[PDB]
Amino acid sequence: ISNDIAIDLGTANTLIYQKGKGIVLNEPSVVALRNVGGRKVVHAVGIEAKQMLGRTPGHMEAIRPMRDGVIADFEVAEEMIKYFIRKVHNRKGSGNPKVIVCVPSGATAVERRAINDSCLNAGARRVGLIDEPMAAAIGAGLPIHEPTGSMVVDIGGGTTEVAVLSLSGIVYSRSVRVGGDKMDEAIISYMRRHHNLLIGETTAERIKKEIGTARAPADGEGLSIDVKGRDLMQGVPREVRISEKQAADALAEPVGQIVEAVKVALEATPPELADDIADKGIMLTGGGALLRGLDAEIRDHTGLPVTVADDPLSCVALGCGKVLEHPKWMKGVLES
Ligand SMILES: Nc1ncnc2c1ncn2[C@@H]1O[C@H](COP(=O)(O)OP(=O)(O)NP(=O)(O)O)[C@@H](O)[C@H]1O
Ligand SMILES: [Mg+2]
């Protein structure tokens, strides 16, 4: 049995795929730091940190060490990664493992060295890096080996990466800093400006999942829920109701940037490849791809068919996993 692992180091979620086990770990990429006499110390990581925040006062502080598709905190990213790697270690398995890590396509040398070191520091022999859109496309089923063109749109928490693949290569790649976190920030700004109500991340993610949509009902308001927060002048808790119409209104800006990033990618793409993507469709992946109507909105504005992958939260990790299982393929990237 193997200790070989592939890591999908998301801004919102970290996934680890183990050779011969599939997905062994799926946890929020948060660290909880307690502040004490000027210092900050790592208290919990992952689902534990997210649990004990939400039971949160004064000390317990939240660091997302990857954020907006960049490494913000090198010290805490290292310890996050270490924790996760140690946590999936199997003692009845091969020595120090081979590791694959999925990095943003707009990742610099430095951030790559940083990833690679955090992994060696955690007990790996060798480390290979694979560009995210390439992993997303493989994970999703795309025929990235054919000379036919393929398009993948990966909507994360901090980033939306759009890429066109052909012939085992990336022909075009671009990332924009818009995804599920800007969606939440927009819903929370909307609650403040229109209904004068302060809300949190959790209430926000809940609205986005429950009535969020990239396109308003043709009706007028559609469905509604009630959400709790607190009045921003009075301090008292309050309930307000909100429609799918309001949510659509709230999300239109970040949705529109996503749509614009797809149009821009098409305008850069070679016509013959563009016509291939026209036949098979644009493939959406990543958790942001689960927003209602988002595929329907990209279809209207581009003219192209659009499909959401199966298990879009897991694509990058499955694609990384596929490379891990294929020794000759993993070869290709350790030579990176
Ligand atoms: N039903 C849903 N509708 C809309 N958004 C959702 C839904 N479920 C999850 N999400 C969002 O999906 C995002 C996380 O997706 P994910 O693909 O895990 O991100 P990531 O890989 O960690 N970020 P990144 O490094 O930018 O690629 C969060 O912003 C969630 O709010
Ligand atoms: Mg991602």
Author numbering: 9 to 344
Show sentences the authors wrote:
An initial domain closure is observed upon binding of AMMPNP by the monomer. Monomeric CcMreB shows little structural movement between the ADP- and the ATP analogue AMPPNP-bound states with domains I and II overlapping with an RMSD of 1.58 and 0.57 Å, respectively. But consequently, it can no longer coordinate the attacking water, which is absent in this structure, and thus renders the monomer inactive. In monomeric, AMPPNP-bound MreB, the catalytic E140 moves 1 Å away from the nucleotide and is no longer able to bind to the catalytic water (blue). (E) Superposition of AMPPNP-bound monomeric ΔCcMreBdmh (m_3, shown in blue) and AMPPNP-bound polymeric ΔCcMreBdh (d_3, shown in pink) reveals a propeller twist: closing of the nucleotide-binding cleft by the movement of subdomain IB towards subdomain IIB, accompanied by a twist of subdomain IA, resulting of flattening of the molecule. In the AMPPNP-bound monomer conformation, no catalytic water is present in CcMreB, whereas the catalytic water in monomeric AMPPNP-bound ParM has moved away from the ideal geometry, thus hampering hydrolysis.
In non-spherical bacteria, the actin homologue MreB is essential for shape maintenance as depletion of MreB through genetic knockouts or MreB-targeted drug treatment results in misshapen cells that eventually lyse. The MreB fibres are attached to the cell membrane via a hydrophobic loop in Thermotoga maritima as well as Gram+ bacteria and via an additional N-terminal amphipathic helix in Gram− bacteria. The crystal structure of Caulobacter MreB (ΔCcMreBdh) reveals the typical actin fold, containing two domains on either side of a nucleotide binding cleft (Kabsch and Holmes, 1995).
